[PDB]
Amino acid sequence: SKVIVPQTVRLAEELERQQLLEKRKK
């Protein structure tokens, strides 16, 4: 059975979203 949410995928998503939010804060 497929793993729907891998660890690295979730980590990269969170990191990119936080980076873009910080960019918008600027």
Added chain:
Amino acid sequence: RTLPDLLPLFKTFILPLERIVEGLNKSSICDSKAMDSLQMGLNALLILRNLAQDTDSV
């Protein structure tokens, strides 16, 4: 990871699958050795996918 040199064997079973699939646009599985090689390739591919469902293996 814990068992290195495991992937080379699967690759040895998987690349002839590439050749077969290229030759798959016509009736070319006439013999039983061809069918056996094809089935070994499919089994190795499924094993690789099941392992790729993990972080270290992928």
